[PDB]
Amino acid sequence: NEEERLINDLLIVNKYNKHVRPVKHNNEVVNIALSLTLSNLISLKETDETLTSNVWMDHAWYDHRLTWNASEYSDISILRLPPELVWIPDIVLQNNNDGQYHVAYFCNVLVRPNGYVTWLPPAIFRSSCPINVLYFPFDWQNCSLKFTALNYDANEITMDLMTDTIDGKDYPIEWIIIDPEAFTENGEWEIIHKPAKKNIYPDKFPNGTNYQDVTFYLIIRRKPLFYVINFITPCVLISFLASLAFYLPAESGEKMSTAISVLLAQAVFLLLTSQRLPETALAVPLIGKYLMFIMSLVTGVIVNCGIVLNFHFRTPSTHVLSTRVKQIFLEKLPRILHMSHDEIKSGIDSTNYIVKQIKEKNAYDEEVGNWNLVGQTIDRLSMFIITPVMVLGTIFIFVMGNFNHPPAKPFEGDPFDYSSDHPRC
Amino acid sequence: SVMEDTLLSVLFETYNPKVRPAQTVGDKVTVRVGLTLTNLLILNEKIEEMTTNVFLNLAWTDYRLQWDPAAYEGIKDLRIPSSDVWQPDIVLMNNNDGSFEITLHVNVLVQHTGAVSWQPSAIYRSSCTIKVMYFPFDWQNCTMVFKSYTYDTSEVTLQHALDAKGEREVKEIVINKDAFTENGQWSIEHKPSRKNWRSDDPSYEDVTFYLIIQRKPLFYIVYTIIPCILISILAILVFYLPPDAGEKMSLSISALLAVTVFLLLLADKVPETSLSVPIIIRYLMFIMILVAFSVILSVVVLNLHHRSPNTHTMPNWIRQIFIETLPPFLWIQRPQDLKEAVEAIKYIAEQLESASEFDDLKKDWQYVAMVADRLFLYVFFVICSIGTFSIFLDASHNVPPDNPFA
Amino acid sequence: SEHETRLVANLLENYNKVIRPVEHHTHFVDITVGLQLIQLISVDEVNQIVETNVRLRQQWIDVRLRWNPADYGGIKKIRLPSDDVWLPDLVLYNNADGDFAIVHMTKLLLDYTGKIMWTPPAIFKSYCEIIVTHFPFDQQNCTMKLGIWTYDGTKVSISPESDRPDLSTFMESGEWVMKDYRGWKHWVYYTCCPDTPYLDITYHFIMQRIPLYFVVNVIIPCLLFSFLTGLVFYLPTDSGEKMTLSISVLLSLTVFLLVIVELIPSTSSAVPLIGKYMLFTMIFVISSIIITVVVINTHHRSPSTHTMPQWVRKIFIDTIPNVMFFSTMKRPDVKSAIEGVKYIAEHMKSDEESSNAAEEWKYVAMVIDHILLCVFMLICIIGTVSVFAGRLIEL
Amino acid sequence: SEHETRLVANLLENYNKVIRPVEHHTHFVDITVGLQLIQLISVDEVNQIVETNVRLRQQWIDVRLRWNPADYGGIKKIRLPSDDVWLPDLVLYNNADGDFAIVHMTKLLLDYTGKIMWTPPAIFKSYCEIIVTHFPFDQQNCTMKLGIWTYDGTKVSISPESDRPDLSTFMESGEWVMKDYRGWKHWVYYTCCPDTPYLDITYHFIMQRIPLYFVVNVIIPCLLFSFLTGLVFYLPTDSGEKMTLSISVLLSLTVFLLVIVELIPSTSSAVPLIGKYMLFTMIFVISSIIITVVVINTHHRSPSTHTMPQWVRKIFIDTIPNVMFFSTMKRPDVKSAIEGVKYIAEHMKSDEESSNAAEEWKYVAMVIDHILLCVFMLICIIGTVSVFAGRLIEL
Amino acid sequence: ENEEGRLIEKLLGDYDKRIIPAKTLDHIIDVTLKLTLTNLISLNEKEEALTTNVWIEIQWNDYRLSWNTSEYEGIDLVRIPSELLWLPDVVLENNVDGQFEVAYYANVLVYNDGSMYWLPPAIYRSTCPIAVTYFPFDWQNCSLVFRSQTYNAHEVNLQLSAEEGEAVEWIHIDPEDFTENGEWTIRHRPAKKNYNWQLTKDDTDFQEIIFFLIIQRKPLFYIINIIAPCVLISSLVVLVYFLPAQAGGQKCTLSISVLLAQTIFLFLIAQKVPETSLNVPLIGKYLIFVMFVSMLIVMNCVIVLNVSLRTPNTHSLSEKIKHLFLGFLAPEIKSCVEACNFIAKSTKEQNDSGSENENWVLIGKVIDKACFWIALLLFSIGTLAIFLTGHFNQVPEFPFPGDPRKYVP
Numbered sequence A: 001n002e003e004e005r006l007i008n009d010l011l012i013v014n015k016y017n018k019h020v021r022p023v024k025h026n027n028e029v030v031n032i033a034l035s036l037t038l039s040n041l042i043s044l045k046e047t048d049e050t051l052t053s054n055v056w057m058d059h060a061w062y063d064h065r066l067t068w069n070a071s072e073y074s075d076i077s078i079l080r081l082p083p084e085l086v087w088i089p090d091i092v093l094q095n096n097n098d099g100q101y102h103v104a105y106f107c108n109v110l111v112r113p114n115g116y117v118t119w120l121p122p123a124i125f126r127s128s129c130p131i132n133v134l135y136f137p138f139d140w141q142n143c144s145l146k147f148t149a150l151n152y153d154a155n156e157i158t159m160d161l162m163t164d165t166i167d168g169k170d171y172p173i174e175w176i177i178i179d180p181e182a183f184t185e186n187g188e189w190e191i192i193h194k195p196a197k198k199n200i201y202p203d204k205f206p207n208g209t210n211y212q213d214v215t216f217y218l219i220i221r222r223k224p225l226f227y228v229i230n231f232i233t234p235c236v237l238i239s240f241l242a243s244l245a246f247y248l249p250a251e252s253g254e255k256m257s258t259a260i261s262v263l264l265a266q267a268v269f270l271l272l273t274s275q276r277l278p279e280t281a282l283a284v285p286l287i288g289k290y291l292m293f294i295m296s297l298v299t300g301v302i303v304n305c306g307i308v309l310n311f312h313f314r315t316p317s318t319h320v321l322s323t324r325v326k327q328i329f330l331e332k333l334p335r336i337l338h339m340s341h342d343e344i345k346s347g348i349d350s351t352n353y354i355v356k357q358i359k360e361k362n363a364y365d366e367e368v369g370n371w372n373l374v375g376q377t378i379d380r381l382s383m384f385i386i387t388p389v390m391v392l393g394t395i396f397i398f399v400m401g402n403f404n405h406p407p408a409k410p411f412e413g414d415p416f417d418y419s420s421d422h423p424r425c
Numbered sequence B: 001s002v003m004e005d006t007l008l009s010v011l012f013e014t015y016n017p018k019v020r021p022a023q024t025v026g027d028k029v030t031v032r033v034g035l036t037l038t039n040l041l042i043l044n045e046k047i048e049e050m051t052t053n054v055f056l057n058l059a060w061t062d063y064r065l066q067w068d069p070a071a072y073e074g075i076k077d078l079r080i081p082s083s084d085v086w087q088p089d090i091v092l093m094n095n096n097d098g099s100f101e102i103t104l105h106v107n108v109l110v111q112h113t114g115a116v117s118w119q120p121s122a123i124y125r126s127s128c129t130i131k132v133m134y135f136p137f138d139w140q141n142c143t144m145v146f147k148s149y150t151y152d153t154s155e156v157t158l159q160h161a162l163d164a165k166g167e168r169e170v171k172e173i174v175i176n177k178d179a180f181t182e183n184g185q186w187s188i189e190h191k192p193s194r195k196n197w198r199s200d201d202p203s204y205e206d207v208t209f210y211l212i213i214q215r216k217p218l219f220y221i222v223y224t225i226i227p228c229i230l231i232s233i234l235a236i237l238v239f240y241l242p243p244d245a246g247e248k249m250s251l252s253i254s255a256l257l258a259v260t261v262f263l264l265l266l267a268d269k270v271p272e273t274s275l276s277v278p279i280i281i282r283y284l285m286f287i288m289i290l291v292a293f294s295v296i297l298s299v300v301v302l303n304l305h306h307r308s309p310n311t312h313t314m315p316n317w318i319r320q321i322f323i324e325t326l327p328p329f330l331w332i333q334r335p336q337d338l339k340e341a342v343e344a345i346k347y348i349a350e351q352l353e354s355a356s357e358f359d360d361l362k363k364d365w366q367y368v369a370m371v372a373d374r375l376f377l378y379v380f381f382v383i384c385s386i387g388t389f390s391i392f393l394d395a396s397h398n399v400p401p402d403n404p405f406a
Numbered sequence C, D: 001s002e003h004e005t006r007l008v009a010n011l012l013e014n015y016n017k018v019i020r021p022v023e024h025h026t027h028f029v030d031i032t033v034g035l036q037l038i039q040l041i042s043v044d045e046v047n048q049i050v051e052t053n054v055r056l057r058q059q060w061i062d063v064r065l066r067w068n069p070a071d072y073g074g075i076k077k078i079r080l081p082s083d084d085v086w087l088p089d090l091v092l093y094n095n096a097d098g099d100f101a102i103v104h105m106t107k108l109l110l111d112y113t114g115k116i117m118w119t120p121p122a123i124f125k126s127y128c129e130i131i132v133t134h135f136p137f138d139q140q141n142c143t144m145k146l147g148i149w150t151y152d153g154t155k156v157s158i159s160p161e162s163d164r165p166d167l168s169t170f171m172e173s174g175e176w177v178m179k180d181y182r183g184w185k186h187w188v189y190y191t192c193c194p195d196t197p198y199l200d201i202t203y204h205f206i207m208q209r210i211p212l213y214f215v216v217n218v219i220i221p222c223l224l225f226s227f228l229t230g231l232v233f234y235l236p237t238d239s240g241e242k243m244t245l246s247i248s249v250l251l252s253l254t255v256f257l258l259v260i261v262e263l264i265p266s267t268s269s270a271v272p273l274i275g276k277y278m279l280f281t282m283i284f285v286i287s288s289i290i291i292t293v294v295v296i297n298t299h300h301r302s303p304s305t306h307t308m309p310q311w312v313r314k315i316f317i318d319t320i321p322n323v324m325f326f327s328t329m330k331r332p333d334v335k336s337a338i339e340g341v342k343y344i345a346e347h348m349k350s351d352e353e354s355s356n357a358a359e360e361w362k363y364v365a366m367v368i369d370h371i372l373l374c375v376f377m378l379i380c381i382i383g384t385v386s387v388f389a390g391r392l393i394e395l
Numbered sequence E: 001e002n003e004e005g006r007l008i009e010k011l012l013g014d015y016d017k018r019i020i021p022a023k024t025l026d027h028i029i030d031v032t033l034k035l036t037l038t039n040l041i042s043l044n045e046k047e048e049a050l051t052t053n054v055w056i057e058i059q060w061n062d063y064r065l066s067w068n069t070s071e072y073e074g075i076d077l078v079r080i081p082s083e084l085l086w087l088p089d090v091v092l093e094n095n096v097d098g099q100f101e102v103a104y105y106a107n108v109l110v111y112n113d114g115s116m117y118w119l120p121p122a123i124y125r126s127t128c129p130i131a132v133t134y135f136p137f138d139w140q141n142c143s144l145v146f147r148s149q150t151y152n153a154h155e156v157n158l159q160l161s162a163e164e165g166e167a168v169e170w171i172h173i174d175p176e177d178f179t180e181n182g183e184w185t186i187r188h189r190p191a192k193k194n195y196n197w198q199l200t201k202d203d204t205d206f207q208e209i210i211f212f213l214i215i216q217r218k219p220l221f222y223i224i225n226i227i228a229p230c231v232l233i234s235s236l237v238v239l240v241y242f243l244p245a246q247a248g249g250q251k252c253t254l255s256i257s258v259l260l261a262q263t264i265f266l267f268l269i270a271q272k273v274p275e276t277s278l279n280v281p282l283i284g285k286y287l288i289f290v291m292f293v294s295m296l297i298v299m300n301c302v303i304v305l306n307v308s309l310r311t312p313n314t315h316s317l318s319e320k321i322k323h324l325f326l327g328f329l330a331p332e333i334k335s336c337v338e339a340c341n342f343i344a345k346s347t348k349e350q351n352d353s354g355s356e357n358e359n360w361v362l363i364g365k366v367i368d369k370a371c372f373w374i375a376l377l378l379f380s381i382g383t384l385a386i387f388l389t390g391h392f393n394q395v396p397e398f399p400f401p402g403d404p405r406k407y408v409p
């Protein structure tokens, strides 16, 4: 096998020092072109704001020491060398969560006779991307993977986006590469944009490791089905049940029970929702806003049911039905709301007393009925005022949520799509 | 290049990285310790642990790594793997796990004068005690203690790092705006650095970086305080419900159910230390006790409402207090056949009169219940308002000091 | 053994473990790959990850590791550390968050002809496209893709050992059933060049979930709540407990939502079968509550304010009660005294009239309850059958 | 330092770190072992694991590593990697689930006389019997057993640096208070032979739990629920809410049982104090509900079908109300018309008799409620004091 | 100087740790195992994994490491780190995680005759499939399977250690230092050598040593926190039959509230039971039973309320039902007299309607009594049977049914 002789010549006879940059003079720059391939998006668990992803880092550089004349050997046009034997550019994910800066598997490099070296190690990365909870669960996130070369400064090695050719003209690969066949869509997230950028920081200096950067962005949109089915619709329906308290007659002693039970169910939903989101304080989540609004409205419904019951149970022995109340709640509002021989002497005296008592009881009863009508009018007014508020608030909140598409173009000031279909020029 | 190979071979022919670089026996190596905060990941209060992503800006001089650049095509500095040179064992001493050392071993920068510079990265989990008294309206004081695990003050001299154009020391955690993520739950108020000694031990010296961070309580505000306020409103409202509705107990006891549900919600978020009670738990317990007392007074009012002469005799003190005095203060202020037929009518009239007297006494009892219920309404409104306002101002007066004292 | 010590010393004296084991660099190493599934550790529906305990059996020939047994006391096989010889870098292409290659560098068996046998253990965490449409009566098909990472088909070729993975020593899952399993080899070419095939072997296991835990823990309580839903319509309105009962059923279902949320997968790809069933139960209970409120309002209607519409009387008092076969429902001062007695009699006139009208309202409410009870029992049965039997018949 | 470079070069040239540092193989290495407690990370009651952050100071003489300071510029102390020299294999015998030996090979301090000082850090996860009987007012005694794994006392002898662990730089726990701590050395012999002692050093720490978190977060709500369940007996039966109150208290107690199971450890060795109190509260509420049902049944006792037994009348209407001092409880067609009036009067008579009997039943029920209210408040106080007073006094 | 230094430098010189110490062809290395249990850390039902802390004692002979004591001042025992020596690759096979090897690589005690004594401690997480039928009144039968992952039966011979000529066929537990788990008690602990007859003496899986741990749970936590509260709360449903059947009686309130509490208990138990779906646990069976009984009692309360609140106008009380239930089971004068007659007639009618109502109420009460007795019997019998099945779930008297030996020291 001539490969053995060739490798011995390259590494042993030539005294290859893997700790030295491949430059003939110690002022030139080694160019490392890198690209990212997303094998699969594993998770974006929002509780601790971590993006787990399976990616394949593609590396390419030149090493003048790993050059040979293919004819002087057999026609060997390529070699596979372990990375522990050759100089490797240490490019690390800087914004990682768990303390894993490097690739998972240090695979062999591929070397051509002209010194071209390609390295394609796969990696599992757990990067930190903050979560914008503003429109949860109708939100889209903007997560980033930031790669830096911390072993050499910008004067020594230059990071660049890899380039590809279509019709004789090469263009940079300014996006994350996704294989349409192998890639399996995430259960919860849809990828909208996937740009790639080489960032320079002019306020730093070239003789430092914090001057260069290559960042890959993933603008992903949540798929709102689990939350719509299990969280939003049942809460919305149970909340709408609170308006039925106004249609429930005061004689049926269950207005307060109904309203309070609705509030308890909403408290259960609050408990469920609290566990799904991080503790950040940038904004209140959309679902949180809706829960606060609906719980406040249901508390108002409970208070107003209490007021109605207090009115319904007033009696002439404890309250006075003033003329103002009668005019307001029995004439005006119902119209506006379109509402729908001593022994015989003793006997005579006894029957007169009976008649007097019966008349007094009848007056008592009719004024009680007046109080009942006042309560019914208050119920009708409350329903007409609160049901539309509930419906409109719910509709507005959730159509605002449903109108939260990503901007359709990353880098607001940029007219480029960063789409793999339309490379620059 | 070839010249870099030659220079490296010359530098490390007899160089031993295990030996601390001292010109003469007794010399001390000056080590400058700086910290750059890249990301304040977490401040887990259950385990009292702060996770940070940092760079350590270390600098020292190694007299052995000196060369004349004129003889090596003007090579001014080298990037040498960190394991090939002596380095001070600078570690995080107050770590919560067993990870003392750095995570990423970036290769060192060595200059022709012998100046070595090293900026390794790490994900550190330090332990800072949490002051759980104003949680979640609390500010924390979490430190990171750095010193040489091996060498003492007789061997190395710790110092603060220098700024970009080294002229004066940097006595703070450095934060690079280009690479820095705001936590979103914590605001950094102060980030000083200081060297600490120990009077008992003259061989001890460390450089401590202090992070004074204030929490943003919006999440807790919403998810605990707002529902608690609504439940307190319901607890007050129970005293406006008429006893005839048969709904007082439903309202009050359902409010108690809601408060215990919120306690279950909050269980998995409050730190489990016993040095103090967080203010949020105090507010929950205050609301719980207020709701329990509302239940007790609702039971009393219901008992008063359903009294009658057949069971109770109304005492003089109750009548004087609740019917004469309180209402104005509370603004309430309230032929054989013919003989048989005559006897039957007389009996009917007597029965009606007896029923009238009985109903009058029952109405007196019910009026007493009404007055007591109004009094409880006012008392509970006052108590709830005063208590909630007091607790909230106490929470809102908790701010980190202007001077970090460090 | 001194013989074996000498043999191992001679084999590795001039052996370079970075060179492929080929006599000429234009040849390819042929590797026989086999997968032995030992245990199905877990399936993660939310993250789409299937964790398995396997052995990756690899066989190939290293021409440089031959020897003549007669020269070594008759030794015909030896065990060598896998780190001492060239190994193929087989990588789990669809790895989710595990190790890409073999990490347990166990010893390998070497014949005197150079034939090598290597069966390192591994824990494969593979990306598994999970379908939750029929959960928990769901069948999952997902694979393990294997290939040589850095070598193409002209340098290292891999061939499956058998037609399917070896499940001889497979521990039974207790949550899944191995319905079928197979392995296929694929040749993939690229627009570059048709002379550089890229080979891989995909092993797929078809799993059928055992739906007993989820049945008893989720579906049965939902069935009880559904059955209780329609029970409120047989409860008379006189007992002030219709809303109590229906709302308490709703609260029980809402509390049970905790159990469902903590038990069923939280994917958003599709709505699970039990998800649809539980949504149906929720809407069923809410509809029952709404109509119960309507009935309670009807029962308490007062004659003074509301007068019975003619169509209501025609339908609910005359027509429907006839066609309800199951039910048993039917289908000086003397002048003052005299004036007072007349007043009492006329007041009783009026009271009886009002009572009769209120009774008619109560009767209409009762008839509506009976109709609704029939309708809701029927809807419960029909909806449950429609949701479940459709998938259950296929099994 | 060229002097120290030469010293280290000449000091490890012929140094074998596999060999014990003794001049003669019949001598023993005398190691001074000291434990420094830096932090008490956690106490796991369920698994009975105590996690501590410690420094394991070790001192011994290695004659092979001595030098004359005058030959090396006066160097008297050097730092060496601990992996370059012989180290004692100290093992945490009662390791639960951590590392058995030191894994952080920090540098050691070597003196020119051969004296070595090594103080590596460690996280000890030691198994210790947790006694949850007085939880949360429980005191724990958890130990750390250390010894040389592979050498007996005649080859390598360990002796404590002092009689107590070093807690000079201990971090205050916030959950546990360090009552006492000590270290003991033990000689263990075997039936083999009495000339070969096996030595171990055991450090033990007496820890007292700070019972504020658990008190506030568990016990106080239980007290509140006990008080309310006692209160149920003051609610009149006429207000149809006795069952509402009692069963809502039971529901609150069930939700809080959920909370407790979330908080308290899930041990099974013995019943904790909180466990006994929670069970007592549950039984209290259940008995309250049962007796409330009895009172409700007595109150709604129909005089038509039931007649008051003489003993009930004698006890609950005559004697019991008298000893309740603090209470305020009491201690032609004309013929047809005439016959109609007579019928009305006699029906009023019958109704009055029935009402009197019903009122007597209601009075008996109310007296029973008063008695039971006193009894249950007394039981609540007595049980609450009984469950905790013994432990509180013990402290 | 330490003579051990010269001895060890002689022994390890020209020593290859890759080479099995088989003296000649067809020589089989005898490796004897003795497992000592230090702590039964836990048995996690959710993961179906058993965590143990063990000291495994491995003994074998390496003829290359023998020396003549007279030549080394009577030295007959040395300690050599295990990383320098050949070892039989004895690993735990049935591990849930990928941890096959021991935790701490202790020094090997080497005797002058070549005998080698290795006692490495280990933390093992082994697969223990869970029999959930009787949870929490259950006992599990966990096994630790040890075999060589390198060498087959033609190269090594795995055996159980023999002490004083008697095979140690059991896990060794030191009576004094061993601490009870707190949730599990060890009833049997046999050890035996097993063969996979589907394989030949090759394949390295033919032979193995299995150590069994038959452990019984102590269900005190479940009894006090789940079982007893659940039973007490569920028994409350029989009280509904003594409540009045009208508004304010609160039959439905009580019954449905007990059902809601049972739902809460269902949520509480969902977090404890293992997720396997081969059997329904005993506790799950009991919860289903009580929930079904509460549903039936709610139905019966609804039926009783419907019967007791019937009216002559909505329903007709046929005498057949009565027998079935109440059995086996001047013009001014004229106007005044007319008014009096009408008053009497109205009173009569009202009284009659009332009377029919009380008849319906009595029928309801009879149904209450009968159904109360039925429900009390049903609930008592069901609860007693279900929770007596668990009490009789005893560990077998013998570690192996048909084996008479007890496998104890």
Ligand SMILES: *[C@@H]1O[C@H](CO)[C@@H](O)[C@H](O)[C@H]1NC(C)=O
Pocket (backbone or CB within 6 Å): E068, E069, E070, E071
């Ligand atoms: C061991 O060495 C001694 C000499 O020290 C010799 O006398 C003796 O025979 C030797 N033993 C054997 C078994 O050869």
